[PDB]
Amino acid sequence: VLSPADKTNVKAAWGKVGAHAGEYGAEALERMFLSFPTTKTYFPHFDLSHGSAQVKGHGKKVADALTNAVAHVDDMPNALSALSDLHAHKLRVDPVNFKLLSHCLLVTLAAHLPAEFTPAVHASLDKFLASVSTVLTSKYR
Amino acid sequence: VLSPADKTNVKAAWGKVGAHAGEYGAEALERMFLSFPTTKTYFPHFDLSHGSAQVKGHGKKVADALTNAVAHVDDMPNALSALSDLHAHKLRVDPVNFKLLSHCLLVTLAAHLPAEFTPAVHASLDKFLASVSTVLTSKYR
Amino acid sequence: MHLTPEEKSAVTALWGKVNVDEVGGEALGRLLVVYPGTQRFFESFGDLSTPDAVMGNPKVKAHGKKVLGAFSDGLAHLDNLKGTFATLSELHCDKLHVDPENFRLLGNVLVCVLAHHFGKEFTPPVQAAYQKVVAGVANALAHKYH
Amino acid sequence: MHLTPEEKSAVTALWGKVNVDEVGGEALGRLLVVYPGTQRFFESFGDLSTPDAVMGNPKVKAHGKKVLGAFSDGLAHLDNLKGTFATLSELHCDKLHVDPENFRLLGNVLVCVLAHHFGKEFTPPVQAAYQKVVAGVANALAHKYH
Ligand code: HEM
Ligand code: HEM
Ligand code: HEM
Ligand code: HEM
């Protein structure tokens, strides 16, 4: 679960991400496609090369959805509702993949936010990403 | 999640298991230990040899807890609250292992109840063991 | 494939008794019923509306036999599954875009089918040997994903 | 362990700039804070109740340095990770009863810690190379479990 402290930590970290969020989501997808090639199977209709506009574009949407989740941290299951139907029922993304994307976001934030990514905040973001992953995956088979 | 038709399939299958639940439980543990040796790391203090009394004994405990879960299908978190604390907080068993014991349980039932293990019932029992696991690992960190 | 010789021998003997028509259709059939996700890849096969629709579909049955045919080939080649499944791998990756996590699901559904058909003779030790086979096959199918 | 020459170079490049004393301390520390479950194996390290208690615990820092030292040995023998780690494998299994799933967790926190330290140097292609390495080290640590 997300405790008070956890929520504060996530709000301050995402807070400092700011306007750089789309670009971070974009780097996070590139890291994932390269480190864990199996994930590309969900994006065959995409141009997956370095600097691709479709990836940049998609990175932005992934980040906006995460901003919205933080904005509704106390009601995530209803706020991410539409995204859950898409991932679990329309797209049928196997849950392991959420762990890979979550790991890649943590690497991205670690690489860009030296001073804020302390141990405590690291644990919080990890907890938050798991919560978001659970929402997006809970109706899946 | 569990539908009424799932709930029905599970009571039916399990009701046949009846008095064999204990033997089936023990069987499923022995299958897990031989097929997936890393699970043995959580039971260092058990005689794990074939026929072992601790395993049999443990077999009844697990089978009994599923019996209680079937009966309390409609509110498992409450009925399994004590075992969830034990597996997620005291033993800290990595979720991966739950899929391994669930698979072995499915193999045991399939091997012992040829006539009841239809595809629809297979499906139901699979969703059921996955919900029990979810409840037993919700809290894990 | 680290199979002990008494393991290769347990696997071999049981396999010699397998009715592929039944098993291949049952395994493929159960994959799509128990894990409806996997339905997205077989849209060309027709009506998968319901369990009975699924286990009666003759396209599901024929393709199952084919899947079991490839599994028979790797059993006859346990020492080189990677070379044995290389083409199938490129196909599942480059043409069909199947997430390899799905290979474990089919392998385990496949083990429950063997247990269902062989009952008692599918003892824990036989199971463990098959678990090793089924993981090596999954791994081999995933090896050329890039 | 499919490491092209370029991956190997990239890996070894970066590693030579790693202060192992401090990186091992951060890595085992963050593991124990982010994944409190892995505290069941170090009850003897004393107090681990908060982040600061963990990150600054001298026993954590010393142990972390041991771990990273073994890791270091592995990078000098990338073509034989199983032999190099075989005695550590049996120990973690036979004596310590560590579920190998924990090896992957530690592997991943190490990737983050490297990213933390190197910023824009830890590029995607370099992370991809370290992911292969941490997976190989975990499989080699897993190899002798029985
Ligand atoms: C933190 C977790 C994730 C979040 C927040 C997320 C968010 C989103 C959003 C906002 C969209 C676009 C909705 C739209 O434009 O209609 C989307 C679509 C998509 N997502 Fe995710 N996603 C997540 C994880 C994943 C992962 C793990 C995968 C698979 C590896 C994945 C695969 C896809 C695919 C294939 C689409 C459709 C893209 C298209 O065809 O345009 N997502 N996701
Ligand atoms: C269907 C899933 C499972 C159920 C329903 C279940 C149920 C139980 C029950 C009823 C107990 C005994 C509690 C008591 O003494 O009152 C127990 C203990 C225990 N469980 Fe599980 N369990 C499950 C899965 C697992 C898994 C996957 C593992 C790890 C492989 C595991 C490891 C343990 C261990 C180590 C104990 C302590 C045994 C002892 O100390 O004697 N369980 N479980
Ligand atoms: C045990 C692992 C599996 C093996 C050994 C296997 C084997 C095969 C074989 C022999 C073919 C025929 C290739 C041809 O067209 O010449 C095939 C095709 C195919 N496979 Fe697999 N398969 C496996 C698992 C799966 C998984 C789990 C799925 C998806 C969930 C899948 C999806 C497909 C699809 C969509 C085709 C093309 C079917 C068609 O003819 O329309 N396979 N596979
Ligand atoms: C890269 C992965 C790892 C490596 C290379 C590694 C290496 C080592 C080394 C060199 C030792 C000292 C061995 C000895 O005392 O003879 C050790 C001990 C130990 N390791 Fe690991 N380890 C790894 C991961 C882990 C994980 C993830 C855990 C549990 C979460 C763990 C638990 C332990 C424990 C409990 C000890 C004994 C500590 C003591 O002195 O009390 N190791 N490990």
XYZ file of C-alpha atoms in Angstrom, chain C residues 1 19-20 34 38 40 48-49 58 61 75 79 94 114 135-138 142:
19
model
C 19.240 -30.078 -21.590
C -2.168 -40.083 -28.619
C -1.205 -36.874 -30.347
C -7.888 -21.117 -19.440
C -3.952 -16.080 -26.095
C -5.788 -12.702 -29.888
C -13.729 -19.220 -29.768
C -16.818 -17.847 -28.034
C -11.192 -28.431 -36.122
C -7.442 -29.542 -33.310
C 12.459 -34.739 -27.631
C 20.868 -32.162 -26.827
C 9.259 -11.764 -36.434
C -0.491 -35.380 -19.635
C 11.272 -25.176 -19.842
C 14.008 -26.070 -22.315
C 11.565 -25.902 -25.138
C 10.215 -22.563 -23.982
C 12.685 -17.567 -27.116
